[PDB]
Chain A
Amino acid sequence: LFVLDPAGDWYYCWLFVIAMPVLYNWCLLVARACFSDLQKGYYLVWLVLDYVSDVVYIADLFIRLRTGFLEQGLLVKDTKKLRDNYIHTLQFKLDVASIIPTDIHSPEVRFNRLLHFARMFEFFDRTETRTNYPNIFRISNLVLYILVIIHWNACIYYAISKSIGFGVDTWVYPNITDPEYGYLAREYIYCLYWSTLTLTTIGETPPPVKDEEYLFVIFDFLIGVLIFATIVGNVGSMISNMNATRAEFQAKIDAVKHYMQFRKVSKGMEAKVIRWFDYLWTNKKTVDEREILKNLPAKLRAEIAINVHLSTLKKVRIFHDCEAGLLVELVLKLRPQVFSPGDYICRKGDIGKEMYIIKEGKLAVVADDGVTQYALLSAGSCFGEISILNIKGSKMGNRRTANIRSLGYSDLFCLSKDDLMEAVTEYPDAKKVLEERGREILMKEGLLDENEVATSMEVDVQEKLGQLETNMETLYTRFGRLLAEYTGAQQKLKQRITVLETKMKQNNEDDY
């Protein structure tokens, strides 16, 4: 058996197939009923198109019986479960009533096909989430709704004019018998013009003559007010959404610009900040990475972070033999960092508690004078790996031994000392290997052996007093426990020697 998946692609392709007869029925049935020249003139065209629409209407009933639904996260493919889920709904009633046979060829008896319109609204709702361009479609979808209302109002005006009589007064459509006005191209196009002119409330419609005519124009003006206010609200809300990214970014610059003039920030630093915000907007780096992925689950976030950082993180010497579980923990700890050109990542003699990996950009190891450069660090290079390791003895003392400067804008990912400690709480053996590898590297440099007799103690006098209190309570339980094991043995010891003592003492009486 075949069961369709609503999230599936083939279901959406069917949604287009059913929505076209529904849209055709909503547009052409009212026109054929009102404009008799349309019905009689193209009777053979409507005969074929009505049959094709009815075939799709019956097919949609069979499709609705074969669309699965998620129950406990699983798609239901049972024939009885799908049938019972659809039949008892209200949509089954509309769908059956839609396709009920007419037992005349007139378009009025086919007005039941106007029901089951929900397939058309679902297609528009489904297309908007699928399209790359969501605002272009939303305008196009909104314009189509205006056209259907304008076309429907055009047909009602012609129907009202027919009921009142053609040419009886100035408000109604002119005389059909007059060849100047009586042909299908003129009467639809003028009625389309009249409906647009009246609903949009821009131009001036011919004044009504009768009280019945006054009511219809009042109704159109009231309807056209609600349509126009809905148009402006929909388009105005779209424009707010497109501008929202720029509007909230311009507020950040304006807030920072106010601070620099308030605190008298020097013009050299002030222009540095302004140049930074232009880089963020031009290259579209305004949104923070951490805020983007915060909603994602930890499994999906780890899957993304593996594809970005795991290739470069496994190139690190200390993380050479790290377990696969630890490496996932480390790449989740990496934090993005962006540096302007000429920025110093770290300076000689500065405390270092982070390791940096270069995602993009070029960094240069430089002398005390910035221009002269010893070496170049490209994308994928890492530095500061030993700073995050808490080696017991280090001549470095977690202080940077090189000056690192960015030649241009560089994207760095930093693993801190604390983040490494948190990751290796659950991997104790790996922590030992990381420290041993760092110790070996520090031997090769010659900066390992230090603090053999140097130790730092920061325990409080009240906290050190606690261990003295703690040690006393532990000993008293032992004093009972050491004796209870021993005295029971000692109680056992006295009888077993005594019975050997007494029996051998009785032997001495037999001796003499």
Chain B
Amino acid sequence: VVYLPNDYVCKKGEIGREMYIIQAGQVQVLGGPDGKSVLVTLKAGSVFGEISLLAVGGGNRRTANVVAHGFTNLFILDKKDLNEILVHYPESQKLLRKKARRMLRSNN
């Protein structure tokens, strides 16, 4: 998927259901007291939002605004696609569920 400049890849409080891989371009994680202030700029080869794939329906909400800086080409893996893949790999499914529990327990 190609994003136009200043497009919102992720919006704060929106549903997170995808994992993005930056093939080209940059994205900016906007945050601050004022807001809309660049905190970190992710160049090509970066992967962000991967934790939203392990969440249940409605489980994950985006916590910061991610804005494309220029024309950004991203590779996206939807949660539905991962769920459709995982039915053929019960061992990896169990491993990912265990990792989800560990992520939930350790962060809280």
Chain A residues with CB under 8 Å of chain B are: 70, 72-75, 297-299, 325, 425-429
Closest Cβ–Cβ distance, residue A331 to chain B (whole Å): 16
Chain B interface size, under 10 / 10 to 19 / 20 to 34 / 35 or more: 20 to 34
Kindly list chain A residues whose C-beta atoms are within 8 Å of the C-beta of B17.
426
Q: Tell me whether A429 and B7 are in contact in the complex, defined as CB-CB below 8 angstroms, given that A72-B25, A72-B26, A73-B26 are known contacts.
A: no
In the docked arrangement, what's the CA distance between A429 and B56, Å?
A: 13
Q: Nearest CB to that of A422 among chain B residues? A: B80
Kindly list chain B residues whose C-beta atoms are within 8 Å of the C-beta of A428.
57-58
A-side interface mostly:
mixed
Q: Does B44 contact A (CB under 8 A)?
A: yes
Beta-carbon contact of B1 and A298 below 8 Å: yes
| 9 cross-chain pairs, A with B, having the tightest CB-CB distances, nearest first | A73-B71, A73-B70, A74-B70, A73-B25, A425-B57, A426-B57, A428-B58, A297-B1, A426-B15
Q: Nearest CB to that of A70 among chain B residues? A: B71
For the complex with contacts A73-B70, A425-B57, A426-B57, 18 further pairs of A-B residues with Cβ separation under 8 Å are A72-B25, A72-B44, A73-B26, A73-B68, A73-B69, A73-B72, A74-B69, A74-B70, A74-B71, A75-B70, A297-B2, A298-B1, A299-B1, A299-B3, A325-B14, A427-B58, A428-B57, A429-B58
In the docked arrangement, what's the CA distance between A298 and B80, Å?
A: 15
Kindly list chain A residues whose C-beta atoms are within 8 Å of the C-beta of B57.
425-428
Closest Cβ–Cβ distance, residue B11 to chain A (whole Å): 9
Kindly list chain A residues whose C-beta atoms are within 8 Å of the C-beta of B14.
325
Q: Nearest CB to that of A429 among chain B residues? A: B58
User: 8 Å CB contacts to A: which residues of B50-73?
Assistant: 57-58, 68-73
Closest Cβ–Cβ distance, residue B75 to chain A (whole Å): 13
Kindly list chain B residues whose C-beta atoms are within 8 Å of the C-beta of A425.
57
Closest Cβ–Cβ distance, residue B105 to chain A (whole Å): 18
Of the residues B5, B7, B58, contact of A299 by C-beta under 8 Å: B7
In the docked arrangement, what's the CA distance between A75 and B71, Å?
A: 10
Q: Tell me whether A426 and B26 are in contact in the complex, defined as CB-CB below 8 angstroms, given that A72-B44, A73-B70 are known contacts.
A: no
Kindly list chain A residues whose C-beta atoms are within 8 Å of the C-beta of B15.
325, 426-427
Q: Nearest CB to that of B22 among chain A residues? A: A72
**29 interchain pairs (CB within 8 A)?**
A70-B71, A72-B24, A72-B26, A72-B43, A72-B70, A73-B5, A73-B25, A73-B26, A73-B68, A73-B69, A73-B72, A73-B73, A74-B26, A74-B71, A297-B1, A297-B2, A297-B3, A298-B1, A299-B1, A299-B3, A299-B7, A325-B15, A425-B57, A426-B58, A427-B15, A427-B57, A427-B58, A428-B57, A429-B58
Kindly list chain B residues whose C-beta atoms are within 8 Å of the C-beta of A72.
24-26, 43-44, 70
Closest Cβ–Cβ distance, residue A364 to chain B (whole Å): 40
Kindly list chain A residues whose C-beta atoms are within 8 Å of the C-beta of B72.
73
In the docked arrangement, what's the CA distance between A325 and B14, Å?
A: 7
Kindly list chain B residues whose C-beta atoms are within 8 Å of the C-beta of A429.
58
Q: Nearest CB to that of B78 among chain A residues? A: A298
